[PDB]
Amino acid sequence: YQPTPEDRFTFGLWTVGWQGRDPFGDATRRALDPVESVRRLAELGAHGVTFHDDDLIPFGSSDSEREEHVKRFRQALDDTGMKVPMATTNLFTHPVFKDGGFTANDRDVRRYALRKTIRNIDLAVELGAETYVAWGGREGAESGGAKDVRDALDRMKEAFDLLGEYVTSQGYDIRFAIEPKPNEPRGDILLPTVGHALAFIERLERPELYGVNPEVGHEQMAGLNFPHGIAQALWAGKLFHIDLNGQNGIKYDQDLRFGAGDLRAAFWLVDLLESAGYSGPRHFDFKPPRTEDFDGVWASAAGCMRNYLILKERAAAFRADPEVQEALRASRLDELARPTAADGLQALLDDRSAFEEFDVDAAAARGMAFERLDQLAMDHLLGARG
Amino acid sequence: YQPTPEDRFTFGLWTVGWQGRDPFGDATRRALDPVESVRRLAELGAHGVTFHDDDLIPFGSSDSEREEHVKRFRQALDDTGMKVPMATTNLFTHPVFKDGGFTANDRDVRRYALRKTIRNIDLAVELGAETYVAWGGREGAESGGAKDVRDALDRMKEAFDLLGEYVTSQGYDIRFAIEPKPNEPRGDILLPTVGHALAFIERLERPELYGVNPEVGHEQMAGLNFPHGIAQALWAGKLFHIDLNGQNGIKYDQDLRFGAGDLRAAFWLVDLLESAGYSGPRHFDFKPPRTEDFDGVWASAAGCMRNYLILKERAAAFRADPEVQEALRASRLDELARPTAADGLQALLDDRSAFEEFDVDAAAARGMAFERLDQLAMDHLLGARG
Amino acid sequence: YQPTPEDRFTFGLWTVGWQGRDPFGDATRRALDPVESVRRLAELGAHGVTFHDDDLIPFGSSDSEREEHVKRFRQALDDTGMKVPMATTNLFTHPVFKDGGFTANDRDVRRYALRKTIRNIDLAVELGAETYVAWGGREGAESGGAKDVRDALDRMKEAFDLLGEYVTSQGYDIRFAIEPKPNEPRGDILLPTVGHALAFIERLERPELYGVNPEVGHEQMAGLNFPHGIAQALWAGKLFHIDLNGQNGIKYDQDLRFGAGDLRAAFWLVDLLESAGYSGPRHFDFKPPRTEDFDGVWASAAGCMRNYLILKERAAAFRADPEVQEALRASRLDELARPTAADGLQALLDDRSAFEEFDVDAAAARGMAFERLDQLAMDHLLGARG
Amino acid sequence: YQPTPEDRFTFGLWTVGWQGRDPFGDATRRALDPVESVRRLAELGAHGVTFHDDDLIPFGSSDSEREEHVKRFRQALDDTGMKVPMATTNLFTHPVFKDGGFTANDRDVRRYALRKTIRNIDLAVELGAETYVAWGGREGAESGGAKDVRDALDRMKEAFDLLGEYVTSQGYDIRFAIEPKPNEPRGDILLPTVGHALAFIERLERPELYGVNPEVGHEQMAGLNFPHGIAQALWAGKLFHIDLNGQNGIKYDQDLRFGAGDLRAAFWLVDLLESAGYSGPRHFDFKPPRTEDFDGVWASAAGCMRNYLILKERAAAFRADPEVQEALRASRLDELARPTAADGLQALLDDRSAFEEFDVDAAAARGMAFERLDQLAMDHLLGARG
Ligand SMILES: [Mg+2]
Ligand SMILES: [Mg+2]
Ligand SMILES: [Mg+2]
Ligand SMILES: [Mg+2]
Ligand SMILES: [Mg+2]
Ligand SMILES: [Mg+2]
Ligand SMILES: [Mg+2]
Ligand SMILES: [Mg+2]
């Protein structure tokens, strides 16, 4: 289970670079030079890295300081063959963003947030990013009166519309991905789930430019089924990027390494991504626990890719197993894929076998055979044949 | 706080009529005649009632039996002045629907579900309903392999598209509302939240015919902020109906009377509905606890309306209080409602005060004053002036 | 992975016998004769069965009817070699228990609940049960004022104390196990977690007679770590029985087959039970989903035992792997097992290396190496060596 | 609703002093001098303040630096009349505690944690504290293999036993309170709920010295009913201290001001505390949101006390209302307080009215009248009479 760049595994600089500061504790690890993280991740078999503007260029940096940081980073990318498929803006760390960026109540902050974002869009394009992610981690509220959500959604639309006008006017070949999170650090965050993000995108001026960047742990913080949500995003044609990690249920955002947390959900996710032929980066937005020294950082990062590759193998074996294919037919997964009424409405209405002569009791008595199928899935996941 | 039909309070027959059967217990109350519930609810000041087909017409009923049940019901509506603003289909109780209705794996069940739905759409129109609700309570799965969600969403779209073709071809003045629920009775239900439902509607052939029917407790079963979700639905122009009740957090669907559960959320919901001028029914989808006899049923139903009316008064006092209006300005709610960059993209880009000369530290130092505002909201809710 | 009676796998009659009635749906399966379930479970390799009084003897049965049901059941146990290690009382289904049994507000109901319980204790002893479980599923409240919890806990203590006086006076060799559940069917249930149950037991007159019967899914309905809670119960010497099933997070009680739900938690549970040498029944309190016909019932029941046995093998391989044993030392699990200050308080106080000369920065810099250990655990679970 | 020191409202230095650093953001407020917080809180009507050792004495401080910080603090207490009823140790911020203090795998860290705790116990006694709180925020794990919970509980017992031996040998009049939290910052924290803490205390050598310090938001992070848990703690005689704040459901620890979050739960809590005559400090462990400047800090702190006092008034009016007293009788709260079988076991067994002649159907038909009672409680909370 050795990854290669062909597997398109990507990591954020802020992931392996997380110093271990949490709400109750100081950093347990020194800062990592981005150049060092690029080199170490390349050695592990990663395909590329991603960055917030402020991960790469310290906030407040001069234009010449900015130039030197980018040059050194480019050199490490050239030395390693690592790509930068995705970039994003930090609109959450600095105190100015304490009430949000795009939907801050203060208008001057919203304009600043846009300008900070645009500056980094230009850098992302220069470094070759195809996807620009927006995680509005400070967009939201702790109290009901602080935020009129209709006005906030107007401001969010306005912001994304202006970004879309910017990238179009510049001729940039880059698309946007909205990353939902239900809460944390705000008490409730706007666009809290994949569904809310999808719905919002349809009200943008140029919806084709926007997709979602769902995160495993974020949807699971609302107790939702992450493979189900990814399926809906794929059905909508909007899965532009994906953030992979682990989460043990409804609690603070743990950002465990992928495969940790809900393992069965990870299996079904990989099954879906591979079956749908998702072609984008497999990006890990995770935090090596602050219990770990640097050797644990790289072990946790390695484990992300390892677990993906193990699950890929098991999901492929599951789908290729003739006993499973027969079980899917026994559970009528084939019938689910056929149209209900390709004969059309009038034919349905005139079809007495669909109502007047439908034997509901005989249909009710048919077992779905789902537990046999699910145990075959369990056996395959655990490598107990099937 | 006495309700009148002018308040547009509506109840489902299945609410006051719930016999108290839960997963671990038999009925504690005898069945209510729908005619009796209409009369009792009218006496309480309700505006109208809603029904599943199977609440009103026992499943398996003859066409003549069906006729007599409808005639008796119409008579009680004529005697009381009660309206029927909304109707829905029971696609969840009968065993034939154990794997769903519209997205059952068995194709013959899906066709039956459509025909059962269409039959009731005709009845709803005859009784004057404006909104036809669809709660796909059995659409979903307990296991990953049982349901290919992309195919299920194709089948769900197909079903709703066919219903839209039916109502258009019949010339019916009725709109559809999708009611999301994250789980229960299925392990995960498709279209689990308002956001997912909104996103799905945009992929229907005639999206204008479809809105959402969010339920307080359902969104709170995913830990989401119900007023936030309603705000998004209103912003999208899709709040066609609303189900009001109470829920104590992430657990089984409690269907407590409205005002119970998260009281502050109820306050902010009423504030929003009244401020947005929501004109639709205030419908209670609640269950009088099975601890109650019939006197408790009517007391709980009365309490639904009472709590709405109390919260309406408090929310109105909050918004009318000059000290609150000043506090909203102090927190820059006025600024949130102004466009970020009505001057347009190029002006924003050339505006040095938006980036190069923006004093981020002075903006960061500005307090939002949200806690003062929220305590004014608390004081108003509790009737401690403000 | 074929179970034998030596594995001590037990099932409740109500598990495979669940007819599929849920809050929103009728039964999908006919009733199973208890004699038939005993025979089918024996064929699957189960060790024994458990029962509520009302599973075995229909409520309201005559003494002669009661006699005939018990005789037929005994015959099937004699024919199959199946044991009855545990029995319990149904104090939740009948409407009389709608506000509880032992803590019902009505005193006459509480006395009835005790007498119904005692009658079944005598039957349990006659059938050879060693453990008598009490799941107070109706003990609790939906509203704050309905239940004074201090008085309810007095009534709960009184009930359990009287049962303990009964079994002592009769000379019965039977112990009690309290089964916690946080909610459902009551809005909040008293003694909601293993911890609450443990704490309560210490206030009983004869605490030695009482332990806990934790259920996987119940603790996970509060988002708690089930292996952690079992560890505390084992540390207290109070793990008298255990209910095994699966649960996908904080939602309604799903009672999925064991191994479903949180698979990693299942692995760590088995690891703990086997490492601690838990000798009691491995009892499955699960529901075959109502999507299943009888073949699915037996497949789901079989899967319970299969998954236990697979996880047992993986957990044993994990613990036996020299690379894992070295990793445990690297993470200082050995040091966790040594006393902190066996030298005693005064020696600790005088030990300058414990404070005045303790190099906190060098200790802070030591990595815990937990992520490497956890990936070895993952590799073992998935059968990817280690 | 003006508080006076007679109301025994206390605040942690770390509450109003929280600088606003969260997992995703820098501080938004400068550090507060503890002397300044004491003065400002006294002006607001607080009774006293509490502290972690490291809030008051910067970590690493010299003995003379330590002396000067304590002297300045004492002076502000003497100037203001403020008391210090409670103190605690910071065993969570410094990296050395990244795997815990009392249950760190490294033995030298556990000995250091004890010595750091003992040093502060001496200071707490000198400043007049009656309660010494222990919040083991780093005691726990993110992964199953990192922490053998039986050994960790041995180490936790050993630690608390040694502290109890220390305070006894010194003759200190101080008691210990364990503060449970289910998770955050560890993935799962040991002793996650009030129940677990209560159960653990009973295994200590001197259980009389230990109680619980439950926090509103912590129990609600497991979805539990906080008044229920407080009731159990009171029933056990173990409510030594209480931390008051607000929490919006199962998510990260929000530490909202008291009254925010679940308002009905706050009402029932106050009702219980006042009805039980809880005499201890009403301590607020809350964080003014990082959106606030210092004026918002004091407004949020003021709101804590205000909301307690409003709820106290409403709960008192509820209990004093003759209509409520009649409703409690109608719901048989009086009967709940009478013994079930003061006549004893043999009398119960011979009482045919308790089983053979008990009319279960007539008892089943009795309504509990809980919804009427709960609406009276709602009316009182909202000041709509009753
Ligand atoms: Mg995350
Ligand atoms: Mg992410
Ligand atoms: Mg509901
Ligand atoms: Mg509803
Ligand atoms: Mg269960
Ligand atoms: Mg159980
Ligand atoms: Mg807290
Ligand atoms: Mg606290």
> Looking at chain B from residue 262 to 301, which residues have their Cβ under 8 Å from any Cβ of chain D?
262-264, 288-289, 291-296, 299-300
Contact flag A256-D142 (C-beta cutoff 8 Å): yes
Is C374 a catalytic site residue?
no
DSSP code, position B176: E
Burial of A209 (0-12, 13-18, 19+ CB in 10 A): buried
Which residues, other chains included, contact C206 with Cβ-Cβ below 8 Å and sequence gap of 6+?
Answer: C161, C164, C168
DSSP code, position B369: -
Contact status, residue D142 vs residue C325, Cβ threshold 8 Å: no
CA D48/CA D42 separation, integer angstroms = 8
CA D101/CA D117 separation, integer angstroms = 10
Residue C290: list chain B partners with CB under 8 A. Answer: 95, 98
Strands B48-52 and A86-88: unpaired
SS (H, E, C) D153-204: HHHHHHHHHHHHHHHHHHCCCCEEEECCCCCCCCCEECCCCHHHHHHHHCCC
Residue C183: list chain B partners with CB under 8 A. Answer: 251-252
Confirm whether residue D285 is marked as ligand binding: yes
Contact status, residue B335 vs residue A105, Cβ threshold 8 Å: yes
Tally of CB atoms within 10 A around D360: 18
CA C153/CA A71 separation, integer angstroms = 69
Residue B146: list chain C partners with CB under 8 A. Answer: 291
Question: E strands within chain D?
Answer: 9-12, 48-52, 86-88, 131-134, 140-141, 175-178, 188-189, 210-212, 243-244, 282-284
Distances (CA, A) of B337 to A104, A105, A158, B333, D153: 11, 8, 12, 7, 55
Residue of C336, C349, C359, C380 for testing the chain D interface, max D β-carbons within 10 Å: C336
Contact flag A383-C378 (C-beta cutoff 8 Å): no
Which experimental technique did the depositors report for determining this structure?
X-ray
Contact status, residue B80 vs residue B74, Cβ threshold 8 Å: no
Q: In DSSP terms, which residues pair with B12 in a beta bridge?
A: B50
Residue showing tokens 């809980």: D370
Residue D262: list chain B partners with CB under 8 A. Answer: 262
CA B224/CA B214 separation, integer angstroms = 12
Contact status, residue C195 vs residue C182, Cβ threshold 8 Å: no
Write the single-letter amino acid at B371.
Answer: E
Tokens of A79: 């030395």
Q: Spelled out in words, what is the top-level CATH class assigned to the domain A1-386?
A: alpha beta
Strands B188-189 and B140-141: antiparallel
Write out the H or E segment, with its range, that includes residue A65.
helix A63-80
Tally of CB atoms within 10 A around A349: 15
* A169–B contact, CB cutoff 8 A: yes
Residue showing tokens 């996650």: D192
CA D94/CA C358 separation, integer angstroms = 14
Write the single-letter amino acid at B252.
Answer: Y
Among the partner-chain residues B333, B345, B354, the one whose CB lies closest to the CB of A105 is: B333
CA A345/CA A358 separation, integer angstroms = 17
Specified resolution (Å): 1.8
Ligand 1 centre to CA of B264 (Å) is 28
Which residues, other chains included, contact B212 with Cβ-Cβ below 8 Å and sequence gap of 6+?
Answer: B177, B178, B179, B180, B194, B197, B198, B201, B233, B238, B239, B240, B241
Contact flag B95-C146 (C-beta cutoff 8 Å): no
Tally of CB atoms within 10 A around B161: 18
Residue showing tokens 């206030």: C203
Distances (CA, A) of B215 to A44, A197, B272: 48, 20, 15
Contact status, residue B222 vs residue A224, Cβ threshold 8 Å: yes
Write out the H or E segment, with its range, that includes residue C283.
strand C282-284
Cα dihedral A370, A372, A378, A381, rounded to 10, equals: -90
Annotate A264-318 with DSSP letters as a single string: HHHHHHHHHHHHHT--S-EEE-----TT--HHHHHHHHHHHHHHHHHHHHHHHHH
Percentages helix, strand, coil for chain B, rounded to the nearest 5? Answer: 50, 10, 40
Q: In DSSP terms, which residues pair with C131 in a beta bridge?
A: C86, C175
CA C255/CA C216 separation, integer angstroms = 9
Write the single-letter amino acid at C327.
Answer: A
Angle, alpha carbons D111-D117-D120 (nearest 5°): 145
Annotate A67-85 with DSSP letters as a single string: HHHHHHHHHHHHHHT-B--
Contact flag B368-A105 (C-beta cutoff 8 Å): yes
CA A380/CA D110 separation, integer angstroms = 43
CA B158/CA B153 separation, integer angstroms = 8
Distances (CA, A) of B286 to B16, B253, B282, D218: 8, 10, 12, 29
Residues closing a segment before a gap in chain C (C–N exceeding 2.5 Å): none
Annotate A148-202 with DSSP letters as a single string: -HHHHHHHHHHHHHHHHHHHHHHT---EEEE---SSSSSSEESS-SHHHHHHHHT
CA C97/CA D368 separation, integer angstroms = 11
Q: How far is D82 from chain C (nearest CA, A)?
A: 32
Contact status, residue B182 vs residue B193, Cβ threshold 8 Å: yes
Which residues, other chains included, contact B63 with Cβ-Cβ below 8 Å and sequence gap of 6+?
Answer: none
Q: In DSSP terms, which residues pair with B178 in a beta bridge?
A: B134, B212
Tally of CB atoms within 10 A around B339: 12
CA A172/CA A120 separation, integer angstroms = 13
Ligand 6 centre to CA of C179 (Å) is 7
CA C251/CA C262 separation, integer angstroms = 13
Residue showing tokens 């995960």: B188
Tally of CB atoms within 10 A around D152: 27
CA D38/CA D69 separation, integer angstroms = 13
Contact status, residue A376 vs residue A327, Cβ threshold 8 Å: yes
Q: How far is D326 from chain A (nearest CA, A)?
A: 37
* D259–B contact, CB cutoff 8 A: yes
| Residue of A232, A144, A105 lying closest to A180 (CA atoms) | A232
Cα dihedral D72, D78, D82, D86, rounded to 10, equals: 60
**How far out from the chain centre does Cα C49 lie?**
15
Distances (CA, A) of A384 to A266, A317, A318, A369, C260: 18, 11, 11, 20, 15
Burial of D7 (0-12, 13-18, 19+ CB in 10 A): middle
- Helices C370-381 and C294-320 meet at what angle, rounded to 10? 140
| Residue of C48, C206, C29 lying closest to C124 (CA atoms) | C48
Residue D257: list chain B partners with CB under 8 A. Answer: 371, 375
Contact flag A259-C372 (C-beta cutoff 8 Å): no
CA A283/CA A216 separation, integer angstroms = 11
Ligand 5 centre to CA of C304 (Å) is 14
Residue of D nearest to A28 (CA): D95
Q: Tell me the backbone φ, ψ of residue C157, rounded to 5 degrees.
A: -60, -45
Report helix, strand or coil for B256. Answer: strand
| Residues D340-346: contacts with CB under 8 Å, at least 24 apart | D340/C102, D340/C107, D340/C110, D340/C111, D340/C114, D340/C155, D340/C158, D340/C159, D340/C162, D341/C111, D341/C114, D341/C158, D341/C162, D345/C162, D345/C165, D345/C166, D345/C169
**Helix segments in chain C, DSSP class H:** 13-16, 34-44, 53-56, 63-80, 107-126, 149-170, 194-201, 216-220, 226-235, 263-276, 294-320, 322-330, 333-336, 345-350, 360-365, 370-381
Write the single-letter amino acid at B356.
Answer: E
Contact status, residue A77 vs residue A83, Cβ threshold 8 Å: yes
Tally of CB atoms within 10 A around B230: 25
* D165–C contact, CB cutoff 8 A: yes
Strands B282-284 and B243-244: parallel
Which residues, other chains included, contact C124 with Cβ-Cβ below 8 Å and sequence gap of 6+?
Answer: C84, C86, C87, C132, C174
* B122–A contact, CB cutoff 8 A: no
**How far out from the chain centre does Cα C356 lie?**
47
* D251–A contact, CB cutoff 8 A: yes
CA A49/CA A52 separation, integer angstroms = 11
Q: Tell me the backbone φ, ψ of residue A211, rounded to 5 degrees.
A: -135, -165
| Residue of A63, A232, A259, A366 lying closest to B95 (CA atoms) | A366
Partners for D (CB, 8 Å, 3+ pairs)? A, B, C
| Residue of D247, D298, D239, D314 lying closest to D45 (CA atoms) | D298
Q: How far is C38 from chain D (nearest CA, A)?
A: 30
Among the partner-chain residues B25, B184, B252, the one whose CB lies closest to the CB of C183 is: B252
Report helix, strand or coil for B236. Answer: coil
| Residue of C320, C333, C321, C315 lying closest to C370 (CA atoms) | C333
Residue length, chain B?
386
CA A23/CA B164 separation, integer angstroms = 51
CA C266/CA C216 separation, integer angstroms = 8
Which residues, other chains included, contact A352 with Cβ-Cβ below 8 Å and sequence gap of 6+?
Answer: none
Question: E strands within B73-159?
Answer: 86-88, 131-134, 140-141
Count how many Cα atoms sit within 13 Å of the Cα of residue C310 in the half-sphere of its side chain.
26
Tally of CB atoms within 10 A around D111: 21
Burial of C275 (0-12, 13-18, 19+ CB in 10 A): middle
Q: How far is D190 from chain C (nearest CA, A)?
A: 8
Distances (CA, A) of A216 to A223, A245, C123: 11, 6, 50
Rg (CA), chain C: 23
| Residue of A14, D203, A363 lying closest to B94 (CA atoms) | A363
Near ion ligand 7, which residues have CB within 5 Å? D 217, 253, 255
- Helices B194-201 and B226-235 meet at what angle, rounded to 10? 20
| Residue of B84, B86, B192 lying closest to B137 (CA atoms) | B192
CA D73/CA D70 separation, integer angstroms = 5
Ligand 8 centre to CA of A248 (Å) is 23
Is B241 a catalytic site residue?
no
Residue showing tokens 């001098």: D33
Tokens of C88: 């319990």
Tally of CB atoms within 10 A around A321: 17
Near ion ligand 8, which residues have CB within 5 Å? D 215, 243, 285
CA D171/CA D165 separation, integer angstroms = 10
CA D201/CA D212 separation, integer angstroms = 9
CA D342/CA C153 separation, integer angstroms = 16
